[PDB]
């Protein structure tokens, strides 16, 4: 704002507002599942055992 009256009385009025905003969200979800199953032998009793 600038106001000059009678070419003698001067006035100035400078007003500034400034807002800055920042947001960051970061999500990580790692899931891991390992499953090993070995079956080597099948052992049975002889039918003629005691």
């Amino acid at each position: 704002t600038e106001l000059a009256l009678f070419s003698r009385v001067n006035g100035k009025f400078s007003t500034e507002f400034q807002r800055m905003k920042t947001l960051q969200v970061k999500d990580q979800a790692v899931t891991t599942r390992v499953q090993v199953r070995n079956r080597i032998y099948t052992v049975k009793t002889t039918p003629t055992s005691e």
Partner: protein, 38 residues
């Protein structure tokens, strides 16, 4: 009727997949030695 005598001489594995065994046709699982293995 062991195979250790042959293994001591030849020094070879014995073929572990052998026929002549029983078989449960229902449960689909080997059962017992029917033929004679010598």
């Amino acid at each position: 009727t062991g195979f250790q005598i042959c293994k001591n001489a030849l020094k070879l594995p014995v073929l572990e997949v052998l026929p002549g065994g029983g078989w449960d046709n229902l449960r689909n699982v080997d059962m017992g030695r029917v033929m004679d293995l010598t």
